[PDB]
């Protein structure tokens, strides 16, 4: 049988799928993620903040 990928398939998004939140996923915390500090962030902390005495 043709073992190649099939061109001639609908390339468009499919508007026929459950649009609701899925209540069937692991609800527990995930113990599988980089636990390190992550040196990839903006070190210049000034783009937006509340300057009032009682902010």
């Amino acid at each position, epitope marked *: *049988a043709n*073992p*190649n990928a099939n061109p001639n398939a609908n390339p468009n998004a499919n508007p026929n799928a459950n649009p609701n939140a899925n209540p069937n996923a692991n609800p527990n915390a995930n113990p599988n993620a980089n636990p390190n500090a992550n040196p990839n962030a903006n070190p210049n902390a000034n783009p937006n903040a509340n300057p009032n005495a009682n902010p």
Partner: nanobody
Amino acid sequence: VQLVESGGGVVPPGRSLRLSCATSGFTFSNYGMHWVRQAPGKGLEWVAIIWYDGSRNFYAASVEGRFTISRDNSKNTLYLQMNSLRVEDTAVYYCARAAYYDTSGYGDYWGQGTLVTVSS
């Protein structure tokens, strides 16, 4: 289309050896692949096929359970793991790109091959 065999050499029988093919010039992930081999002085023997998404594999009866075919689409690489090599497995191995016509398929862009020798 560039298909390059690598990883041949000589081993005592009973040993394992992994072959692989590097490729470019086309989208690897859209095509299935084949391995064939030619023992010196002999004609061609089909060895194995792997589907474009890795979902199916078929082997020549003469090698099933001894040979494993696999691929990694993210590296544009095709692999063949040969276990328990027998003397009878001495051959030049080649990689080929799957093609299909109508009622049967064919290959159309092969590599140069690499030689695997099994001997004591």
